[PDB]
Write a protein that binds this ligand. Sequence first.
Ligand code: CLA
Ligand code: CLA
Ligand code: CLA
Ligand code: CLA
Ligand code: CLA
Ligand SMILES: CC1=C(/C=C/C(C)=C/C=C/C(C)=C/C=C/C=C(C)/C=C/C=C(C)/C=C/C2=C(C)CCCC2(C)C)C(C)(C)CCC1
Ligand SMILES: CC1=C(C/C=C(\C)CCC[C@H](C)CCC[C@H](C)CCCC(C)C)C(=O)c2ccccc2C1=O
Ligand SMILES: CC1=C(C/C=C(\C)CCC[C@H](C)CCC[C@H](C)CCCC(C)C)C(=O)c2ccccc2C1=O
Ligand code: SF4
Ligand code: SF4
Lengths: 143, 73, 146, 159, 741, 80, 63
Amino acid sequence: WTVPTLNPDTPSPIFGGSTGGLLRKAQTEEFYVITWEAKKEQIFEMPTGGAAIMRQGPNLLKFGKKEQCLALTTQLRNKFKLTPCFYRVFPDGKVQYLHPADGVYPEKVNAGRVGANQNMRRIGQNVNPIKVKFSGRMMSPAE
Amino acid sequence: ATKLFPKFSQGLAQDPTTRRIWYGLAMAHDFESHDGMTEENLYQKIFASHFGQLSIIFLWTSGNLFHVAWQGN
Amino acid sequence: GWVTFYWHWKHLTLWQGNVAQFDESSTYLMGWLRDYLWLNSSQLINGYNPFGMNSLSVWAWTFLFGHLIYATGFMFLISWRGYWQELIETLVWAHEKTPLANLVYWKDKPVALSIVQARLVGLAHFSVGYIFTYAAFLIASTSGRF
Amino acid sequence: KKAQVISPVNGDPFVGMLETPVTSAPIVATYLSNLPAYRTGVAPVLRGVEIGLAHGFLLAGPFIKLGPLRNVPETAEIAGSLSAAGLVLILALCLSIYGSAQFQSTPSIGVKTLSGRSVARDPLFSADGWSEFAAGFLVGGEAGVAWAYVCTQILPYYS
Amino acid sequence: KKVKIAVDRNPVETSFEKWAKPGHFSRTLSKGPNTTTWIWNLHADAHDFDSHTSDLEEISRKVFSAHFGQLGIIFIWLSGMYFHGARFSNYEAWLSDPTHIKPSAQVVWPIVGQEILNGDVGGGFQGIQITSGFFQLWRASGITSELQLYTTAIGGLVMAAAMFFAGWFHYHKAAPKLEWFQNVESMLNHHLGGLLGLGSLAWAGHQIHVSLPVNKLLDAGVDPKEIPLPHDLLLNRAIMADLYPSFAKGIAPFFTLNWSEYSDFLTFKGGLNPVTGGLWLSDTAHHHVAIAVLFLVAGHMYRTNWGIGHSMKEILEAHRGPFTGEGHVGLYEILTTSWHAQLAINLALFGSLSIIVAHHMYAMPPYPYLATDYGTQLSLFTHHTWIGGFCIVGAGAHAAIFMVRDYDPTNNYNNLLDRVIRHRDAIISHLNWVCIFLGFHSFGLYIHNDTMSALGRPQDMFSDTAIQLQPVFAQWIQNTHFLAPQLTAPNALAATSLTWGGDLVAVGGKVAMMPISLGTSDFMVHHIHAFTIHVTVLILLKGVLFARSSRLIPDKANLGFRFPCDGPGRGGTCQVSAWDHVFLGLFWMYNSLSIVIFHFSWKMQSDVWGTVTASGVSHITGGNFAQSANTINGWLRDFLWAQSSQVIQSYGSALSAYGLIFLGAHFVWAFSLMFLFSGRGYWQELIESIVWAHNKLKVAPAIQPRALSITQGRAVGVAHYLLGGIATTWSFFLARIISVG
Amino acid sequence: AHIVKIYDTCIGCTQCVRACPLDVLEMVPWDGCKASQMASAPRTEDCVGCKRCETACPTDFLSVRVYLGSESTRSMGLSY
Amino acid sequence: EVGPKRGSLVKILRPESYWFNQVGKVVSVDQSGVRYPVVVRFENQNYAGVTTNNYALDEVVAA
Ligand code: CLA
Ligand code: CLA
Ligand code: CLA
Ligand code: CLA
Ligand code: CLA
Ligand SMILES: CC1=C(/C=C/C(C)=C/C=C/C(C)=C/C=C/C=C(C)/C=C/C=C(C)/C=C/C2=C(C)CCCC2(C)C)C(C)(C)CCC1
Ligand SMILES: CC1=C(C/C=C(\C)CCC[C@H](C)CCC[C@H](C)CCCC(C)C)C(=O)c2ccccc2C1=O
Ligand SMILES: CC1=C(C/C=C(\C)CCC[C@H](C)CCC[C@H](C)CCCC(C)C)C(=O)c2ccccc2C1=O
Ligand code: SF4
Ligand code: SF4
């Protein structure tokens, strides 16, 4: 598996237009693009509001928030049994792949993804906040 | 981008929302949760703040005295 | 509030020579309502009427002021963040899509008051209204008689 | 059953504005495009003068007919015009501090015009542009309040 | 044939086996309790039939039999009121003198000193003065005897037992299938022809044959003992042809379409009866004849088994516009598939109807001596107003529940519901703006008047004197309905109400109904009404449209309808659910209707109700509403402080219980604030520190003590808030108006 | 950014990852408390702080722990 | 083998546990080098609704 490049030639589902779509965050900070290959035309539920019709084949869809993309991801994975993958697009054109960051979905092991933010102690073996006092910023004993 | 108002907290100064203003108004005197605060600097800022409270109290009594003397009977 | 109600009524009945009214009515709570809160509000709330006003009108206005602030704290105390954040999402849409007004844009993103923050804000509105209401009532019901 | 009126904005169903007769009727878009706010090629100082003249002329009326001195015959218009002058001054200060606050980032994304041609950014949305816009707003607002007073003084059927 | 009876024989066995096993209706609670939250969930999910199972047939059967149980309970309650009017009332004494004797139908036992509550109401009676208006209703029915109330009570108990037998039958013995419930064409045809058409026709028959002659003789001074019994007015046509000579013609004028001959008992008089202060029963009889015809022709509209008629699916599907996409398609399926979509509409219109009832029962008092019982009139406005607001909030609730559970986006593509959910942001944004606009321009007017009159500038207030905001549109409508019989309703002898204008009707010295003027105070309070209504609509509609998703939480539908929060994340997500929007819409419904009923009470006591002893109408508060209600201090002083003198000095008198429920309601309301201001996590730790003391003494229960759910805390808080506030208002109203009115 | 720490009491039931609506958590093999999986939080820049993860953690209390930290646009669920 | 038997009653010594100083019954003890190997089932459920939890050999004690 290798990181897929975002295809802009991918069509979008049949949506009649909403008001829950993109805001100035898309133009200024960032927005998100989710893609998936469908086997048929199915009326799914937009996380922004309203129902859209996915197209037979590949689809592409814009969203202003990552939680929207993962909501649709779990909806397409659980109700339609698809395998979508979304990105993070910046207004200058930079695309950043996000969800299956190793190819497989994060609930499954991949035999090589590194464990981050793992405290190797018990939650009661954390120190008292008096020991992490005056560490610069206000810091939790979990660090 | 990163703002300037919460000089005492860099996590708030990077907040893009209106929460920065409020939480900087309400974390201003929690000196021990400031950025880069030591214990000695804490005690010193508290010393100066007590001096400021004293000045304010005495100005308040001066104002009561002044207004009773001026606009009172 | 209980402490100061007790003090104020005991002393209003002492100063008026009517300690018997307290000795009779303070043993039940309709006594405290009627003979203390309802009775002694007579000049306060008539501080201003459609016929005119007197010097107690400031304390009447302040009375109603505290009644407003207290109840406004109820808004931050009962309604919680998530109704208001979605409301503000709608208002963000409304501002970004309104012509001649999307020209003007915020620099700080409008979000609802946080949980702890609105707890403090409701407590502050509550306390200010409590305090102002009782201060107005006290000063007006004591200055109106004496 | 054909001929649906409501369309998405510029054909994009994911942006979220839903082009609608109140939004993008020919007459409505014509009127909004002709307003000095949306004349992104003219100098912002003059658009500010025009906007300020309008707003300073309209907001004298309330202070005149509803102010505290509305019932004394000749002092009413003077009082309301001075009040509108003060409010225009306050608004000009608001505009100046808004220009201080907003225009520091210079966002790099372009602007199109619902037909593809990449127009330039409005010089109004720049620090110097908004400075001169608030200058024009002050000048035009005070002038419009003064002329509102004048129109109370000279108009025949001013009741 | 399509529309037919379709039932299953003996679906559910009748046994107490599932009575001994609580929580049987769900898969989670049937395992048994381990924590106390189970005890609350057992009750919160008791009638949540659409989560006990998925098949709409069993849900529908449960709903049907539950409705039967509600009907049986309503019949028990009605029979109880008739029985209390038969045994424990002064009704037969009140009929002889309804202008002097207070209607009472509840006697209190003399146990712990509450015999003081058995007030001197009149007619040699001692009891609690009722305000439900049953005496006026019974006089209008033509009862005139306690035996008829007794037998009506026994008939109500018979019908209650019948309804409960019917629920048991239609659940356990022969329960209908889903395709029987789904015949909405037949249900509407029948509920319009037979239920509301034939019901109004039968009530018209009673009004022709029993109410009209009995009440005509009652108004002619005849003693209720010497009035002919209704069966004697049925058999002996001579009595009726003496009272109405058109009964000498028989029913021929009907079949010959010489209906004008019937103009003796089918009238269009309009206005009020000068001797009773209520609507003419001939007017009501003609009314019910007319609406019976109307509903019987309206019940022949939909197509059931013979090709004539309409398919509601065809009306809906063929109603679509260029602005609205596919239109009403899929709504037939929504409403024949979702019980909650039906419940939402039905509750909304039923509550709006109850408020219609409240407004139309005081301006057009239908019953004799109803208007001059100011307590009954005030209570009957307040009660139905409150029931309407509650039903409307429940309509918003069940609309949200539909949107969460029963909504399917496949059925709804570019139909009206999809197109609403797609632009909910425009909807709620404009609603927010109008709520803010109205709040400012309706309450800041009151604040402006408070500030002006406090500063001593009454010439700067918003009053009928200084700066007039006259309600010219309502004034024009008043004048348009006052002048209606002259031009636009020539066969009406008078206007519908005297509130439009004209002369007053005073009965027994008391004012039954008089013209109602509207000025700046009425403008301001009406705009306050619209403001509060719009905010309640904002909350409930925002809960509906954002019940599945928002820009904050896109997966709110999977979270559910009733959930506290997703977390403290996204800055904090508490009360994002569509349940918490109902929880807040309850508060705003209370705030709206409190002002509505306050407007009613003050306007009635100031500008309508009163006595005429000499030449001059002397009202209760002296018409202060015009000049005093421009300020919040006005509603304080001259309404909440002035009209509270009767409830706080009621101690030691018959109305002392009203003062008691004043104080206790103030208690309960404030008690609600323990649940609304606080949060579960504090009480769980307090509870576990208490459980430590219970463990130490070996008295810790097996059912683990938990703090109430978050949702349950909010529900308890809103319940205690509404109860205390409404009961405080109830006590205040009744104690005030039983004394001064 | 909020602080999500995961402790060695994690029995590896994947529930915290399935509950996460922002794809902050993932399950790493054997480079943790033991073999047979373990969780991890590499993408905490996208954590909003909803604590669905520790709502779904079945261990005593919570192996996964969200400590609410400095907010941003990604950590406040803002589409604006 | 390590730990208690697979039906024994066990008092939990984990300080942050809901069942601290509370008796539980062993479901099983994983005989690998796993940390927190002891699986204890409790008659009463915690605030999350769980009745089972994994504990270490030093967090368990008889009776
Ligand atoms: C005595 C006769 C009888 C018997 C033995 C049963 C037995 C059963 N019924 Mg049937 N049922 C009956 C009569 C009976 N029913 C009647 C008369 C009705 C019409 C209302 C129904 C309608 C009905 C439905 C719709 C359902 C059942 C169900 C059930 C099962 C469990 C019910 C349960 O938990 O009961 C215990 C419940 C109660 C004791 C509640 C009684 C509520 C009464 C009616 C109203 C009282 C309200 C009260 C006035 C409020 C006071 C307020 C207070 C604060 C003062 C069981 C097979 C359920 C089933 O099959 O699910 C598997 C089911 O869904 N029954
Ligand atoms: C002329 C025919 C007719 C009449 C009078 C009614 C009347 C009623 N129906 Mg409807 N219904 C009908 C036809 C009719 N229905 C048909 C054909 C269907 C199939 C589509 C339905 C399906 C239906 C459902 C699904 C529900 C009702 C409900 C109701 C009741 C609503 C409660 C109310 O308004 O209080 C008014 C109360 C009264 C007027 C009290 C007297 C009731 C009398 C005794 C029964 C009416 C006659 C009855 C329908 C015929 C059978 C008599 C029986 C001896 C066999 C009401 C009694 C609801 C209800 O309350 O359920 C219990 C409900 O859930 N009905
Ligand atoms: C549902 C409403 C209703 C009902 C029930 C009645 C009933 C009655 N009206 Mg009224 N009426 C009504 C509405 C109603 N009215 C309205 C709306 C108007 C205004 C137009 C009038 C205007 C009016 C006038 C002007 C008069 C009446 C009269 C009558 C009576 C004569 C009936 C008659 O001649 O019709 C004929 C009806 C039938 C032939 C049906 C009889 C059916 C029987 C009962 C069948 C049962 C037999 C059974 C199968 C077997 C026996 C069982 C056992 C013994 C073995 C009767 C009491 C007359 C009267 O007596 O005045 C007091 C009269 O003069 N009515
Ligand atoms: C025709 C009327 C009607 C019908 C059939 C329903 C039916 C239903 N509603 Mg809806 N609802 C209604 C009116 C109605 N509601 C109204 C008027 C409101 C506004 C208050 C609501 C608000 C509402 C909400 C917010 C919710 C429901 C829910 C439900 C479902 C389960 C209700 C349940 O189990 O409660 C069982 C009964 C109780 C728990 C008793 C409540 C206790 C009350 C508050 C006590 C106070 C009442 C008393 C008169 C005051 C005196 C107290 C005295 C005892 C001291 C069920 C489908 C729930 C649902 O479907 O969610 C999944 C839900 O969350 N309803
Ligand atoms: C007295 C108590 C109080 C007050 C003033 C408010 C005020 C408001 N609520 Mg809240 N609310 C409260 C209690 C209160 N609420 C309680 C107890 C609950 C139950 C939980 C709620 C639940 C609730 C919900 C659920 C909603 C509201 C909404 C609203 C707004 C609608 C009205 C509006 O914008 O008009 C304009 C503002 C007012 C009328 C407030 C008074 C201001 C006056 C006019 C003077 C202005 C002063 C002026 C600017 C001078 C400034 C002086 C300078 C020195 C600063 C407003 C902010 C709604 C909302 O935000 O959407 C629109 C909404 O959806 N509230
Ligand atoms: C609102 C309400 C109420 C009340 C109500 C009422 C009162 C109603 C009524 C209703 C009604 C009052 C109804 C009625 C109905 C009736 C019917 C349904 C009848 C039927 C009959 C029939 C069906 C017959 C037939 C026939 C004959 C026998 C003659 C010949 C021909 C024929 C065959 C046709 C209350 C407050 C309590 C509560 C709440 C709710
Ligand atoms: C009304 C309301 C809002 C909306 C309030 C908005 C977001 C902010 C208030 C609007 C402006 C900023 C009012 C400012 C007026 C103050 C007088 C400013 C004084 C502060 C200075 C002294 C610094 C919430 O965000 C909320 C959150 C959680 C629980 C309850 C509530 C709640 O009740
Ligand atoms: C007071 C309070 C509590 C504590 C209330 C406790 C848990 C329950 C109150 C009393 C219960 C119902 C015990 C009453 C007695 C039992 C019904 C058993 C009967 C035994 C004899 C008395 C007959 C909360 O749990 C809570 C949660 C969320 C928001 C606000 C609050 C809140 O305000
Ligand atoms: S708080 Fe929410 S977003 Fe953050 S890690 Fe936990 S579940 Fe994921
Ligand atoms: S839910 Fe808890 S136990 Fe399960 S994998 Fe996540 S952190 Fe570990």
